[PDB]
Subunit: 170 residues, 2 copies
């Protein structure tokens, strides 16, 4: 056996049960089943990555704002207690491109907005039941320069495996 | 070639720490405060920490607005940082002591951005900062702003490439 590669496969299977259950919440409830073209749940390496992405038609937040849309608020609250299902901690990232590139060297740009959207989703997860201490960090990532897709605007929820969280908290 | 280009970046990151302390000793006011400053090479790149003391907090208490000296340290190191391709990851760490409205999560991320804007106004580039992080709280030693100059592999992992 081993004790380092066994807690290490009990986990891959833990995060896999999470992913399977998240899709069950989504598919079997119809309030989120129509929001599915905004949700991508895949396995990366820090753990489980839940992406909640904007569509040209429907953004999750109001233009240039950190106010969640009614349905975004529904996704955050629908998944919160399924996330409490396991002990792993979370990393919430906000990716924003609502403002022009140059507002960057200004007061409230995509930087403040991206952080604010991350904390806004946080407060929402928390309103849905998320246990205290689950969130590990909030990340704000403004969009980079392009010359001259709306995936560029999304909130990512990373359920961290033991490695990743150890690395983030060394 | 791998470690070849990797050793070039290491040597380049070396010039930076060195070029950083240059001004910390040469500028009488960064020197008066070097004991809030901590530049150490980490496995991810060059880490700069701006620590709080018990009389000298970097931000007004409970606020994300910088104190005169925090404003100085940041804008002074900015020109420098800017001389090299390397990008940055800005992290804020709150001190526990308020939880449902405004929390250390909003506070930490806000200090991360308030710092980035001091840098950005101190001449730092536009597109230099890769991300801002609010780590909240997990004594003035945990009320710090950590500024990470990322090496190419540290920054490639963050971008997900």
């Amino acid at each position: 056996p081993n004790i380092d590669e066994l807690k290490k496969r009990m986990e891959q299977s833990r995060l896999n049960k999470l992913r399977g259950d998240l899709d069950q919440l989504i598919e079997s409830d119809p309030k989120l089943r129509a929001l599915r073209p905004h949700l991508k749940i895949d396995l990366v390496q820090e753990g489980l990555r839940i992406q909640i992405i904007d569509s040209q038609n429907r953004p999750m937040f109001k233009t240039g704002s950190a106010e969640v849309e009614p349905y975004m608020r529904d996704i955050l609250r629908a998944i919160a207690p399924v996330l409490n299902g396991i002990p792993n901690r979370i990393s919430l990232a906000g990716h924003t491109d609502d403002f022009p590139y140059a507002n960057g060297e200004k007061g409230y740009s995509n930087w403040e907005l991206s952080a604010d959207r991350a904390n806004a989703s946080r407060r929402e997860l928390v309103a849905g039941g998320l246990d205290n201490g689950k969130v590990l960090r909030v990340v704000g990532m403004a969009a980079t320069m392009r010359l001259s897709d709306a995936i560029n605007r999304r909130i990512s929820l990373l359920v961290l495996n033991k490695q990743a969280e150890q690395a983030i908290l060394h």
